[PDB]
Structures are given as structure tokens and as C-alpha cells.
Amino acid sequence: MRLGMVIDLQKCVGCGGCSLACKTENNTNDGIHWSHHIATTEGTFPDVKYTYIPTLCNHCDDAPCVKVCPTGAMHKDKRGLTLQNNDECIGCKKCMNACPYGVISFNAATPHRRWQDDSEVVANGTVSPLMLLKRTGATATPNENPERGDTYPMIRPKRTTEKCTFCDHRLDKGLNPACVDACPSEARVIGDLDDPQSKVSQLIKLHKPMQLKPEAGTGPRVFYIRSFGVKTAY
Amino acid sequence: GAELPAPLRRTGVGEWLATTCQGCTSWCAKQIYVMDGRALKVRGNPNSGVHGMSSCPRQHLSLQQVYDPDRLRTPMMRTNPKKGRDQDPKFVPISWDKALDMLADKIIALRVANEPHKYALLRGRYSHINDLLYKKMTNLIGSPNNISHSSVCAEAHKMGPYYLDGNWGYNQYDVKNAKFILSFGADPIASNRQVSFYSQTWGDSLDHAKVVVVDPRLSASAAKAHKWIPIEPGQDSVLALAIAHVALVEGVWHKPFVGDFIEGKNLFKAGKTVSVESFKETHTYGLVEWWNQALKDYTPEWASKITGIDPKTIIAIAKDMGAAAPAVQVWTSRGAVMQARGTYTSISCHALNGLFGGIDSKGGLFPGNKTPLLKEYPEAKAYMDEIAAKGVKKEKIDQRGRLEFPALAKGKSGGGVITANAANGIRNQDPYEIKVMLAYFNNFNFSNPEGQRWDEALSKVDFMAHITTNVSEFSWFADVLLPSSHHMFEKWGVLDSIGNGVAQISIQQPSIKRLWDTRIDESEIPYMLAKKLADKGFDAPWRYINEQIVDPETGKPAADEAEFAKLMVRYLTAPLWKEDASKYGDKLSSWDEFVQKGVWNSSPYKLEARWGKFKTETTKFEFYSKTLEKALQSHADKHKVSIDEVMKACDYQARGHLAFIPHYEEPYRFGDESEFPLLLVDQKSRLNKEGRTANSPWYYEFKDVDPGDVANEDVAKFNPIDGKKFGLKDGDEIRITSPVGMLTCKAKLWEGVRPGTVAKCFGQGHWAYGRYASAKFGVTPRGGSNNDLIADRYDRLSGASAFYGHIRVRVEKV
Ligand SMILES: Nc1nc2c(c(=O)[nH]1)N[C@H]1C(S)=C(S)[C@@H](COP(=O)(O)OP(=O)(O)OC[C@H]3O[C@@H](n4cnc5c(=O)[nH]c(N)nc54)[C@H](O)[C@@H]3O)O[C@H]1N2
Numbered sequence A: 001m002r003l004g005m006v007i008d009l010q011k012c013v014g015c016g017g018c019s020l021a022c023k024t025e026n027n028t029n030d031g032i033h034w035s036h037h038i039a040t041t042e043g044t045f046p047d048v049k050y051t052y053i054p055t056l057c058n059h060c061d062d063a064p065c066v067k068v069c070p071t072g073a074m075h076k077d078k079r080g081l082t083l084q085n086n087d088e089c090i091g092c093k094k095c096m097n098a099c100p101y102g103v104i105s106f107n108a109a110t111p112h113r114r115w116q117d118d119s120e121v122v123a124n125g126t127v128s129p130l131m132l133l134k135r136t137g138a139t140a141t142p143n144e145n146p147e148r149g150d151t152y153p154m155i156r157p158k159r160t161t162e163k164c165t166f167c168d169h170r171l172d173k174g175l176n177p178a179c180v181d182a183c184p185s186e187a188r189v190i191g192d193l194d195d196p197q198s199k200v201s202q203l204i205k206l207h208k209p210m211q212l213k214p215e216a217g218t219g220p221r222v223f224y225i226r227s228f229g230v231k232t233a234y
Numbered sequence B: 001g002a003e004l005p006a007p008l009r010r011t012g013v014g015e016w017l018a019t020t021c022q023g024c025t026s027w028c029a030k031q032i033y034v035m036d037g038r039a040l041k042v043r044g045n046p047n048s049g050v051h052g053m054s055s056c057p058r059q060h061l062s063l064q065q066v067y068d069p070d071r072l073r074t075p076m077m078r079t080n081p082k083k084g085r086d087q088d089p090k091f092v093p094i095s096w097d098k099a100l101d102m103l104a105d106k107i108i109a110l111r112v113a114n115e116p117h118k119y120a121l122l123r124g125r126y127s128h129i130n131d132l133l134y135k136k137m138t139n140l141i142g143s144p145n146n147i148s149h150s151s152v153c154a155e156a157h158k159m160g161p162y163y164l165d166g167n168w169g170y171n172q173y174d175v176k177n178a179k180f181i182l183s184f185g186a187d188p189i190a191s192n193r194q195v196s197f198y199s200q201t202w203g204d205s206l207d208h209a210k211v212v213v214v215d216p217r218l219s220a221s222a223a224k225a226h227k228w229i230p231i232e233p234g235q236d237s238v239l240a241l242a243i244a245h246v247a248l249v250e251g252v253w254h255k256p257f258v259g260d261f262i263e264g265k266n267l268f269k270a271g272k273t274v275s276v277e278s279f280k281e282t283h284t285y286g287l288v289e290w291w292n293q294a295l296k297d298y299t300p301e302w303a304s305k306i307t308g309i310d311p312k313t314i315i316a317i318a319k320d321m322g323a324a325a326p327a328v329q330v331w332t333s334r335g336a337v338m339q340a341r342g343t344y345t346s347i348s349c350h351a352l353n354g355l356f357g358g359i360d361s362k363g364g365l366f367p368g369n370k371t372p373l374l375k376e377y378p379e380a381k382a383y384m385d386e387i388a389a390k391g392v393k394k395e396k397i398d399q400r401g402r403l404e405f406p407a408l409a410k411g412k413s414g415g416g417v418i419t420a421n422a423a424n425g426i427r428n429q430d431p432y433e434i435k436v437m438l439a440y441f442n443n444f445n446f447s448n449p450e451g452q453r454w455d456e457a458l459s460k461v462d463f464m465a466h467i468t469t470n471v472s473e474f475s476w477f478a479d480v481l482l483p484s485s486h487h488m489f490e491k492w493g494v495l496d497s498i499g500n501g502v503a504q505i506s507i508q509q510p511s512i513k514r515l516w517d518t519r520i521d522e523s524e525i526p527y528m529l530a531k532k533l534a535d536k537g538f539d540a541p542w543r544y545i546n547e548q549i550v551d552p553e554t555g556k557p558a559a560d561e562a563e564f565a566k567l568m569v570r571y572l573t574a575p576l577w578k579e580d581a582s583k584y585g586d587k588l589s590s591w592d593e594f595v596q597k598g599v600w601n602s603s604p605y606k607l608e609a610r611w612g613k614f615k616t617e618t619t620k621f622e623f624y625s626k627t628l629e630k631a632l633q634s635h636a637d638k639h640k641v642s643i644d645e646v647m648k649a650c651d652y653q654a655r656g657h658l659a660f661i662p663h664y665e666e667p668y669r670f671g672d673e674s675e676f677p678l679l680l681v682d683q684k685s686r687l688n689k690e691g692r693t694a695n696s697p698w699y700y701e702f703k704d705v706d707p708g709d710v711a712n713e714d715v716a717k718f719n720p721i722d723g724k725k726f727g728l729k730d731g732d733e734i735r736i737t738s739p740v741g742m743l744t745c746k747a748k749l750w751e752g753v754r755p756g757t758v759a760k761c762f763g764q765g766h767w768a769y770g771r772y773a774s775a776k777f778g779v780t781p782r783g784g785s786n787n788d789l790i791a792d793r794y795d796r797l798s799g800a801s802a803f804y805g806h807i808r809v810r811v812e813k814v
């Protein structure tokens, strides 16, 4: 089994809804986005092309982040996913240097520290992050998703790395990744690339698949098909 | 920690509750995922026939609005009797009873003094239960001044559809079946009125539709289009008119809709008039008169000289649209039409929807489907006393209907709101002073052009109360703050949406326990205020509510605030769930089923339904708008002048016949071009939930999803040509100055900007709202406020404020 994702760039409108869904799903600290993007502008006016490429962990066939991890915290599971036992992460950052794609973040900052602020913009009138935290019963942020704790810390400790888990906790329940459900055009599809009849397997035979940095030799399993833009008419 | 054992796992077991998003007038049906009493996720309501589960990205930002750490938790009163941008209000907390006591005393004082018309109700956003607070309460008090925000929105965008085919309203666009899409400034995968559905369909549609986007900037939509036309701001109608000209010369109008020459031969030759009697129109009126009076001379070469567009491109577009007809749809955005002469851009662009037959056709555009939703509570005439009956006849504070403010909504002189001009009437106490103001869900100091005029106006109002979640810029000037329960998570309401060939009606309901000591703007607060007014000797609002707004099943009035909030929605939606709505769409068995599904869908639109029966003077699609002539004649007769004198008084160039046909108005411009060499291209952020996500950190974290923009910054985008000309580099702190004001932000060089323009998102520049949206709350803004640059100007035929085309600016570093 080799789970992976196919992203249809013609369907994609570059809105970031996938990345925002990832924020709500996985309780990433402010500034940490497991799902993100690579956007480029090319050409000189008036012949200008803008392209948006959504990015995530490619859950590689030959993951360097796994090979360099001294504790074994970063590992492959039986679905082909690259996951992390956060409890065994010593924050050495070797995975970040080994990953060619820059999709791993390091919790140098105390996650959700801004919610400990108890100042009020209008005293005894407006509320505060800390008060809102107390009112809702949340531990770190009122937006924290408890589902995440099924398989991974809902709130990660400082001095650990983290990245896209392919919403493994949702897959365990037979559900879809949050970013897949969040896409208005159904541009994102996941499946078993070892199953020739899966939608993903058929998509990359029906369309020419493209990968990010295949020359790095990791065998990424996020594939891009088609084109964000179209050739200019007239 | 270890993975949890299956009996203790939590993924997927929470509850989904239906509501409606209002980040834009798409008004998408949603479900909220709730666990441990907290809202954790938003998704599109799968039962929605318009958009299904599809959503734009802003749905997730909703979660940082309800859980905004700068929301008000209590009513407040200011203790600084002075008001002003420089005056700290020194708000202190008070009870609801005390806050409404204060407001109630001021209202009753107006009535005792026979000046009820000096009360004003200001409405920003709203739901379809607004009639009580907006209209009925206001008129029962005795005021004509229920002032919506419609004219700072898109009323100019309704002029074409109304005066050509009788629709004072918006259209849905049949993208799934389109063969040609021509967008004058619309960016439907980022803004406009069904971002979820048009984002769902846009990329797929490129395989069967040729798409041209006309916009001074390379928008997301233009980046996914076959042609980007980087029009000079305010010149859109030149292209629309030349397309129509070529269509006639080439003989490729849609004959099943328009008609044809009696003898078959195409007699339209460039520059030469045609006999009206030689053509037989079918469902249109005025084609030949339009040609003879103007269109015969709107050649591709004439258009190329003004716009720089290749005439071969104009010709090729016209032919492509002819071959695609009737699967042709022309979009207009605020950008094209919210200009001082923009009524005729709406008309000129929308005329193409008739000429190529797209109106009410497959692949074209058409109005929202009919639904049985009620929009008003019962008439209140029997509850109007003599004080109220006299007050409601006074001239409105926004001066609608004066010679220079026709505001011809639905064909009526003084028929339309003039939101931005209410500040001027208040400012000048013309027609009279406003002494008591209630406002909700609005922030006109920030959202209206030259909003400092609202700073001034509000500082001159004896008593104002603001119904709001946050202390926004408008709130700064309030005497009393009345904190609103959040519309999307703590409120009963009802909304609608159109697209995908259907109209839907969706519920708003509380999905969490109310966080703070707030009340629902449109139900609980007017209810509580009516009780307070009745306690003080004015019980007409209370009697109206208790006798006329009763449960559709039990016939009983509400027993308390919470019951009334739901009753307001039950009453207007009863035709959907109490009665059989099968004739219009879904059959619902009960109120509970309506709430559980969360949405009612109409049947699919019947194509060509309006052909031959438009609500125009002729009942035809009017290229020569007898409908508009009649409205202008009414206004002219009212003021004892000719129509031409109305045109002159309203700073339009049209005279004679040109007042009634698609024609070219040179765009109005303000300021010396030598001193102010750049044209502002105002745009929305695709992460703006109107003016309400600037206090959401996730907004800034992903701000570069706006093509060309920069995460965690407010940037103005310049073409590198102008960057070199003005010595600008990426990241430079800059000041942008217009004749009426200035702002500071950062510079970004981007080739997707037409040279000679500067493209900058509206949405930042808050100095209040919250700690993330401002640098120093109440003092110093984050980013720059676009509307401080935009001179207070109007499309006087519609009443609309102008946000585009006339704004000249200069830029400098630091
Ligand atoms: N993301 C987001 N979407 C929204 C909203 C929001 O707040 N945020 N608000 C909703 C609301 S209330 C409204 S009324 C609708 C409005 O939706 P629209 O009427 O479709 O237009 P705007 O979204 O206001 O965007 C204006 C566009 O016009 C362009 N333009 C500016 N000047 C000119 C010109 O002179 N000629 C031409 N051809 N184009 C010009 C700007 O670049 C910009 O792309 O959007 C709704 N959709």
C-alpha cells in the first residue's frame, strides 16, 4: 500500500481553503502551516502568468527525513505514510535538513502563547484571549480540535518538529483528509497508488503526472496533473 | 502519547449543526462541527442545491470571529461626552436594562417634541428577518430614515438589469453550460456572489467555455482565463460597445431572441443609419434606434484608440460570442460600474446579454428562482399614531429624490438609498438634524468613501447606539454599545442564495451556548427595546410585535427573548415547512426537518421563462430603455426641468436620446493628473469576510492567496515600470496620497498591474476592531485604509457611491 494524492491544477483556484482547513484540523501554531503553497508570477506586462501549486508532505517512497532521524521518531507506517512519534522527538532538526521540500516545521515557539494574553482592548468591556480560553474550556486555544489527539498530540510540545500527517487520524476512521473535503472543486484526490483501479492510479495514467523535485530521489507521492492556467487566445 | 483505543477515539463523532455564512452575499448554507461545546470546523451544507459541500476559503476564518478575543461581552456607555477620532470614549460597562433605558428615553423625547424623524436606523449587513428592526420599529417611532448600505454596495450593478429587462437585482450565471464568458471586472473564484459554486465549476468550465477577463489587475480569475484585458479604469464600456457594433456588422446577434431584418439582408453598415421599419424585433426593443443614435459609430478602431486594445481582438471576441450564442454570459463587477457615470457601463455591458441571447438562456444568466419565503412582517399601519404618520413623510436624511440625487431604484425618483450621503445630511443638518441613531452590523466610517465624513457626522449626533460584536471604527463614536450575538454561531436567522440554476433558503441557528452577555441584533434587541418603550409610555412597537408577530402554528406571541428569536424565523419560513412548497421546490414535512436539513432548494430554473414578459415599460429587453426614459421623465417633471437638465445636474455627458441607450460616458476623474499620476485600483481580498476578518490572524497568515500580495502585510501593487519611475522597491514603506486623504502601507512590484495604476486590497487600515486588526487600538492603524483615498462621489442616477475610476493618487517613500 502506497497512499498518495493527485492534485488537479486546472480545478485548483489557488484559494488556500485546504491550508485553512489544515489549520482547523491539526491545531498548528500561528505561523505553522502543514499545507501551504508555491505561487509564481512569470512574464512582463501584459503577458503575465500566475500559478498556484498547493503543497504538503509528499509521504515519500524513500523518505530522507526517516533515514536521518536518530531516535526513530520519524517512521513509515504500513500505508506508506511518513508519521512521527512526537514523544520520541528530541528536536535535533536533522529531518528538516534532509527533507528537500521544506514541509517540516520546528516548534521553537511555545504553541498558542498568544492565548495567554489577558489584556483587554476595552477594559471590563471586551474580553481577552485568556478569558476566552477559560470561557470555552479549551487548553491552549478555543480553536483546538480534540480529534487530533487520537494519534498525535493535539498540542505539540516546544522543541519538536511536525508536519502533515495525511490526516492519519481521519483515515483511521474511514474519513477523508480535511484538505480534501475542504476543496470546492474536488481538485484533491487520495488513494492507494499500488491499486491499479484506484482513482489516483487511474488519474496519473489518464493525465501526465508531475512531481515536485523528483530529482531529489525521494519518490514523492503527491502528483500534479493538468495546468493552472491556459494558453492566451487572440 | 500512545494512540487511543477505538472506544475512546473522537475523530468523526461530534455534531454538525446547520447555519449560514455571511462572509459575502453568497450566503452559503453551512454546517458547524461541535465538540466539547466548541465550534471546530465549518463545511458547506451538503444538502445545498446551489453549492453543495463546496466552499470558499473564508468559511474557516469564521472560527476566529466567534472566538475573537476582542468581542464585547457587555453593554457599555461612553463617559467622555466629546466624540472624535482623537477622543477616547472611555467606555464603562452597564446592564442591558440601563443601556436600553438610555436609548428609550432619547427616542421618547423625540416623540414628545414632535421630532421623531430625527431618529435614524442604520443597517449594514442583515438577514431576511430585518423588517422589524429596520422598517417597522423605525416607522412606528415615526421616522423615514431606515438607511441601508445598498448604495455603497452595488446598486449601479442593478441599473442595466432593471432598465433593460426589469430585474432590480442580481443574476446567477450558468457557467456549467457557458460557451463564452466575458467578465468586466468580476473575479468569481475570489469575490462576487457565489464564490463557493463558481470556484467549484470555473476550472472545469474552461474545457467548453472561452473566458475573457477585463480587469486593470491580473485577478485570480484572469489568471485562469484565455485572455486578460488590462483595461484602463473606467473604459470598460468602450469594449462592450465595440463588441456590439461588430456583432451587428457581422450579423451575429442572436436572431431567435433579437429578431432580424424583414428582407433577410444585413443592412447594418458601419457609420450608416438604418431604417427602423426594415427590422422586426422579437423580444427586444430599440435595436435600430440604438444603432442610429450611437452604436453605428462605436467601431473597433474607435475603441482601439481609447483603450489600446487591438481591434482584431475586439473583432475576434465579437465573432466568438456570436458563434457561442446563446450560451454567452457577460459579468459586471463593482469595479466596472461603481463610478460617477457608471449607470451606463452597467447598461452597455448588460446589453450584450440581450444581444447574444444569454438572458434567461442555457449557458447565459438569469435572476434567482422564485421561492415562497416571506420578507416582511405584517403591515403596521394600524399602529401608526399621528406623530408617526407625520414623521414618516419627512424627506430622508440622505436627500434621495433631489434634482441631483435621482437614485432611480425600481424606476422611482428618490426610490433608492444614498448611504454615503446620509453622512453629509447629518454633517449639514440638511434636511434636518439627526438626534438619535441606532445602527447595527455596519462600519460606515471604514466602508464608505471618505469615511472621515462619518467621523464628523457621528460626532454631531446627540445619542447613538451601535449593535456590534466588536468595537469598530463606527463604535468609537457611540454613546452606547449593545453587543450582538454572533450572526453565524449564536443567532436565529434566514438567508437565501442563487446559483447552479436554483435558489435556496437556509437557516441560521445557534450552534454553541452563548458566550457572553449579548443579544441577537434583529430579534431580541428590538423586542427588549419595545418592552422598554412600552414601560415608558410608548407601547405601539410592543403591541405591534405581540399582536402581529405570533407563532405560525400556535398563534401565540413569544413568551420571552429566546423564543422570539426563533419565532421571527419560524414566521417568515412557514410557507416552506408548515405549508406545501412543492410548487416551488422541496417539500418539507416540519420545522424540525427544515432545521435538520438546514436548507430548502427550489426546482431548477425554467429557461426562457421571462422571454416576452419582462417587467419593462415595453415588456421587451430594451436596448432603447423606455423604462429609464419614464423614470427620468418622472424625476424631471418633479423638479420642473427637462431630462437633459437632469443629466447636466447629475454630471452625465448624455443628452437627448443618449440618456436612454448604451453609450460611452468618459469616466469621471478627480484631481490633477500631473500631481496624482496613478489610478487607484481598489480590490477585495479573497479572505475578506466583508470588513470583518481583519482581526483574524489566519487572514494575515495566508494573505498572499491574493495574487501578487504578501503574507502578514498590507501592500499596494505597482507595475515595475512605475516602481522604477517612483524609486520604489518591494517592502518599502510608502505613503499614497489623493486629493482627499492619504494612507501608508508597503510597496510591491508586480507585472500583473496595468502601468499607470496601483492595485491595493481594501480591508486593512483598521485603527479599532481589535488587537490584531490595529497597531495600537483606537490610535494607530495596521496597514492603510483605502477609503480615506476615495473622494465622496456618486452615480447619481442610481444613488451608488463611486469606489473606482475617479481616484488619482501619488506615491512616495516613508
Ligand atoms: N472574498 C470576498 N468576496 C466577496 C465580498 C468580500 O467582502 N470578500 N463581498 C461580497 C459583496 S457584499 C459584493 S457587493 C460582491 C461584489 O463583487 P464584484 O461586484 O464582482 O466586485 P468586487 O469584489 O468588489 O471587486 C472589484 C474588482 O474590479 C476591479 N476593477 C476595479 N476597477 C475597475 C475598472 O475600472 N474596470 C474593470 N473592468 N474592473 C475594475 C478590481 O480589480 C476588482 O477585481 O462580492 C461579494 N464577494
Ligand SMILES: Nc1nc2c(c(=O)[nH]1)N[C@H]1C(S)=C(S)[C@@H](COP(=O)(O)OP(=O)(O)OC[C@H]3O[C@@H](n4cnc5c(=O)[nH]c(N)nc54)[C@H](O)[C@@H]3O)O[C@H]1N2
Pocket: B123, B124, B125, B149, B152, B153, B154, B440, B441, B442, B443, B444, B446, B447, B448, B467, B468, B469, B470, B471, B472, B473, B484, B485, B486, B487, B488, B521, B682, B683, B684, B689, B690, B691, B692, B762, B786, B787, B803
Ligand atoms: N474601498 C472599498 N470599500 C468598500 C468595498 C470594497 O470592495 N472596497 N466593499 C463595499 C461593499 S460591496 C459592502 S456591501 C460594504 C459593507 O460595508 P459595511 O456594511 O459597513 O460592513 P463592514 O465593514 O463589514 O462592518 C460591519 C461591522 O459589524 C460589526 N459586526 C461584525 N460582526 C457582526 C455580527 O455578527 N453581528 C452584528 N450585529 N454586528 C457585527 C462590526 O462593527 C463590523 O465593522 O463595504 C463596502 N466598502
Ligand code: SF4
Pocket: A011, A012, A013, A014, A015, A016, A017, A018, A019, A054, A182, A183, A184, A185, A186, A187, A188
Ligand atoms: S482548496 Fe482546492 S482550489 Fe483551493 S487552493 Fe486548495 S487545492 Fe486549490
Ligand code: SF4
Pocket: A056, A057, A058, A059, A060, A063, A064, A065, A066, A082, A098, A099, A100, A101, A102, A103, A104, A163, A218
Ligand atoms: S516530503 Fe519531506 S517530510 Fe514528507 S516524507 Fe518526503 S522527505 Fe519526509
Ligand code: SF4
Pocket: A068, A069, A070, A071, A072, A073, A074, A084, A088, A089, A090, A091, A092, A093, A094, A095, A096, A160, A161
Ligand atoms: S527533529 Fe525529531 S523527528 Fe526530526 S530527526 Fe530529530 S528526533 Fe527525528
Ligand code: SF4
Pocket: A018, A021, A022, A025, A026, A034, A035, A056, A057, A163, A164, A165, A166, A167, A168, A177, A178, A179, A180
Ligand atoms: S492531508 Fe491533512 S495534515 Fe496533510 S495537508 Fe491535508 S489537512 Fe493537512
Ligand code: SF4
Pocket: B021, B022, B023, B024, B025, B026, B027, B028, B055, B056, B057, B058, B059, B194, B195, B196, B689
Ligand atoms: S465567505 Fe461568502 S462564499 Fe465564502 S463560505 Fe462564506 S458566504 Fe460562502
Ligand SMILES: [Mo]
Pocket: B025, B152, B153, B154
Ligand atoms: Mo456588497
